[PDB]
């Protein structure tokens, strides 16, 4: 679970690493915040998307109960830092600061410098303004900070909320009890594991079988050595089998008796 | 115990470490100092909500002793939060600087810069104020900080004299004595961690047994190597075992020996 | 897999190690952006397309699962290259500058120095620019700077993109399951290490018979005194026994019972 | 294989070590810098050249494919040379700053000193220069160093192709596979490291016999006392022996079972 | 072989340790730079001549293969002193600055002090020259350095060049093979450690036993008591048997069997 | 042999340690420079005289090959201070700084101070001068320094031939083989030793039978007491025998077999 | 041996660290130099000749062989004193300023203060003298420097000529070789030793006897309980047999067997 975590410590430490540099301009703003806060945001979620055997499984396959489950375990990268990113701000006042309405904002009691300026407002972030428009962009950066970290603790409490509804929701609308629950998740996770482990020894000792059909006689450290003195092999099971064993399984029931995953189907 | 203390400790240091910057300002003062002071105390109350189990045993049973005990296990997170955000000051002098009466308060005698000053009264967390000003608005700074510690030490007092009342009615109004309560709890959570470790172990002893039905052996350590030598499993107990251990018990007592768990039920 | 982000970890070091000098000069500054950014890649290019044996298992048979699979592989160092050098800034800016248009923005309201200056705009990033031209030159740094960067997080992108939909293909158009496919990866690396390391000691204890028929006696540690008295040797295959051996292999199925490689085909 | 990248890092301290002097001159900066940059690449040539003993088994013979192999193992150390002294800047400069056309130059627009100034022109390097020259002479600098580093970025990619076009040719024009070319390189080196063992313990062996005959005792460590317990001796091969050992060996098959070296045609 | 090496870094600590003092003067620069700079080298060829038991051998025998190689293994010790003394510089520079022609060299321009200054021309290294003779003497300075440069390079090419058509030339004009050869250098190595050894023990039991003869019992460690435990001793070898072992000795063979030296022609 | 390097490093460090002032003057420079440089090598002279037991050998028998080896064994730390002494300088300018002829020397052009300067010129190296003989005295200086270093150099060059000569000499001109010498060389030392040894432990047992012939019982170590276990003793030897042993020895042959030094003839 | 050195370090260490301070006076410089240089050396002589047993041994008999010895033993210290004060200077300076001729010494040439100044002469090492006679007394300063350094080279000259004279002599006029002469005064070593820890030894148990009469019992450690253990003893020798062990001895030979000490000669 804490892999997340640190992925997260990851995503702050490269915001305040790779780079930032509001480019002041009249339009070029806008598309330059939304790109350097979202192309990120993409690209964890992809990365997200990729590690998820879910997804692969389902694939294989080829349902409510998966998409949420997977997209929820992808979605925690992208808005941890988008959230990271609003309350930061200096990306919120940097491509909405052309459309900040001169006329409605006071300051030292002056009305503006001209009705030419929507590209001298848009400069501010960039600090390049003269001294009396230097004590007048304190008021619109303000303004658009607070804009942004609203933003931000708003949409924290809303994935707050979100993941409480969820939890409320997926306990009350399921078949089982929530220890038995506890009981499932537990084997997936060793069964995945041993079946991993015991996958690669297989392997590794019908490669060992067949490169000494080839030179008469294989070579090995004591651990393998103990590997091919222990198990023995002759050949894989056939494809069918592999076919049977992949796939998503819903909770089945034989009589009295609870499966709890495809290879356990295979009984 | 100790957990709620760590995430005080935790709490105070986000406080701390995130960011605050007052948005001098008509009228956003009001909102930002609502939202940033309690967004992260609803936060901190879904937390507390999510990780305390009872709240899973009532919706899978799906009742004021199980309502009580729960919101007083989350809501420890909030309070000492609220308290260090108020007893900090400049948070609530953030919020309630332009409701001041600018006519009630004395300082080096001068009415009030004009009637136009309420923009300029909630302009002074942010500092900015001229040399009159500066030397004027340092009154209304401590009474408003003033009003905040008072509100923080009276919420602590009135947290304290909650929880007493609690506890003295807890103990008043209950079937049992005391004693015998602490080794009610001490069993709770011994039968709940020895739960854990052997549905664990016979977990992953099952997924042994399945994945050497498919290859013909399976790679164990040698830790995992003893634990099937000693305990050996066929298959688990039916759904109608699982649900009815899970549920709320309430204290029932068999014909003169007491129940202290369901699954103490399932004698 | 960390192989490649070490050498993207070099990659980066050697790019912050060698050189960098913008010739500001009319039309140099193209070639020499090109030239700097480019070559390299292609270095890199090269190195992973070297370093792959299944181009030399290719090349040995003499197809688009193979390319695909080659130029996956390769193309991971110069991608991370060429971003990091956009996302650098400071190589584009000094490639593009002499073809900004000199009507076309805003500043310290003055038209420009002259149409005479193309050289003097292409002059900008070696900072060389008088106190006019210097209020002057940082639009059109900045305007350069934000090019580069949208192009950087647009290549990320897009390279996110085509990887998510490379691995969504090859799982939906692949005759096997994922799991077995994870099988026979892991098959592929232990035949191809038991291999190497048997073929090494192999012509190690040959090499000992050939000088011993000279001398008359070998002189050899412990080890290979162990190797020599275990596995004795007296000539190695034919050479059509190693062109079987070499080749790519395409999944072929046995009746029942599938192979994974071409030694394994050799049974 | 590690051993040319030691030498190339010894390559590069010892350009940082040594000396350099650009010696501002009508005349000698052509030479100096030819020399100053060949002669260390004609001698790293020749030092790879000695250290290949493909080349003393080449003459001792007295061949396309033998060649190629030499060269390409000593070229490798001129060329990471070459390189790093292009890129380096401030050695090209010096050698061709004084055949730049005092015309086709633009800066703060002045014509040229005079018609005179040759000798002024190749003085620049050194730094001395008066202030309108200071301010010009920038220029030819900056595009003095583009060439340089031009040049050496094209020469690292024609290397770069070089080696890779040679590595496929090689690879499709030979008869084995190049599985079987690996196992041959491993017997090359194992055999090659064994017959260096066995022949000075032999030769340590019998120079003991010679002394002990003439003084009635030998003396000698436990070590060499096992050496002549162990390996007797009574006389080395003849010289026609030794004659048939040496030489170049392309590989020559015997009916069904290949031959890997002359001293395996000694079977 | 790291001998020599090790005396190249200590040549070069002396170099940069002793002292050098130009004596800016008319006629003494000539006499002092010949000397400070091959009286050094005159030594270290002394010192590697003597070193060199082959001499010995030589005239204990009172021949081109002989002089050859005494002559290199000498010569590369005053060889790495030229070479780093002309690359230093300052040096050359000291000797052949009054030959100088002051009429042809460009500078600032004026003719030259007058026809009376050649003794103010050699006076230049004493850094002693007025400011006009200051931004004068750079030039001469400059361009001798230069010189003793390209000297110095070409004088590291042709000890290059010279040393790999030695090697050429000995492996071609030789009757025996190389490996062979090779052989031939591990066994004269070897019995000259162990003649050594022996001859030391020898020695030193003879005169433990001549002390002996006069006390009565001798007084020894535990060290020399097993070597007299062990290896007795009566008296040496005549004369003639001396004679016979010294001396130079060319490859002769015995019918079928080779020599590899003297001693072992003693068989 | 490194004990006249340590004495060589002693030699300098004391040179650097003791004390050195040029008294400036007019004829005592000529006396201090002879003392201070010549003393100290007449006490390294008979230092080397000393510690040279063959000239005990020689006075005990009270010859040309003997006084060779004898002074060249002793003059190696007189001249390796008078090398010392000289390359220094600051010892040859302090004595020979009067005889300057004030006519032929070039400078800043005035004649001389006067005719009356012979004491002025001496009063140099105390560096006390006016500014016109400060300018003035650095050529004398230097020239001073000139002669010194160069009389060293050339020092150096005819000891280092004078050594060459030697060896080239003894060995052309001696009755054996060189082998044989080295080890004659051998047996000398280990025959030094082992005597020295055997005297100290049979003198050591007498005393002791001495004093418990007093005493009636003496006191010893553990060592002492295995001493005299081992080694018994009643008396020593006659003086004609300690006589015979003495004195000077040639190299003289028995018939047929070799003697080398007097205590072998005591055979 | 080394005693000494060990001593002179210190002679030298205390020179440098009780005082010193030249009474500037007319007649009493002469008086304090003389005794502050030679009243330690007498000192130092005293303590030599005291630690010397052989005047003990010589005054208990009641020559020149005798003489010789001991004072060369005893004065090694005055004279490595003396030595180190004449070198040092401002010690015969201070004691011979007066006595300067002063119409007899060439400075800034004006003739001398007056013909009053022999008490202003003897000031000068107290260094209070005005600036012309500032710049006047450097030159006797130096002077008397210059004869004191050239004094104590001269002394150390005489000294190293007369120990060699001391030894040349002595091996030429005694009756014995030098070889036995080691031996002897190796056995007198030996015998002094052991002598004295003998003595210790014996006279330990005898008083531990004579405690015992006493008591009735003695308390020991375990090592005086061996000793008394192995050793008895039941009362010394008679006083004549002490006054026959002391003495000087001359070497004296019995028949054929020659002795080397009185109680040698006590068999």
Do not use: M
């Not at 975590?5 to 702050?12: D, E, I």
């Not at 939890?167 to 078949?175: A, E, F, V």
């Amino acid at each position: 679970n804490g892999l997340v975590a640190l992925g997260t410590v990851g995503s702050q430490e490269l915001f305040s690493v790779v780079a930032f540099h509001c480019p002041c301009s009249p339009a070029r703003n806008y598309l330059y915040g939304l790109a350097a806060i979202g192309v990120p945001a993409l690209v964890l979620f992809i990365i997200g998307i990729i590690l998820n055997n879910h997804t692969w499984n389902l694939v294989a396959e080829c349902t409510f109960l998966l998409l949420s489950s997977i997209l929820g375990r992808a979605a925690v990268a992208p808005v941890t830092w988008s959230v990271i990113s609003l309350l930061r701000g200096e990306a919120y006042v940097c491509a909405l600061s052309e459309f900040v309405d001169p006329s409605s904002l006071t300051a030292r009691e002056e009305h503006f410098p001209s009705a030419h300026a929507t590209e001298i407002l848009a400069r501010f972030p960039c600090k390049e303004n003269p001294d009396n428009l230097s004590d007048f962009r304190e008021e619109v950066s303000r303004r658009l900070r607070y804009e942004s970290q609203l933003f931000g603790w708003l949409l924290i409490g809303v994935v707050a909320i979100l993941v409480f509804l969820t939890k409320c929701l997926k306990h009350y609308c399921s078949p089982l009890s929530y220890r038995q629950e506890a009981y499932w998740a537990q084997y997936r996770a060793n069964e995945d594991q041993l079946f991993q482990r015991t996958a690669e020894v297989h392997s590794r000792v019908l490669a060992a079988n067949n490169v000494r059909r080839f030179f008469g006689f294989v070579a090995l450290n004591k651990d393998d050595e103990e590997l091919i003195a222990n198990f023995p092999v002759e050949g894989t099971q056939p494809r069918p089998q592999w076919n049977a064993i992949t796939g998503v399984y819903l909770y089945r029931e034989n009589q009295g008796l609870p499966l709890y995953s495809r290879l356990h189907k295979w009984a």
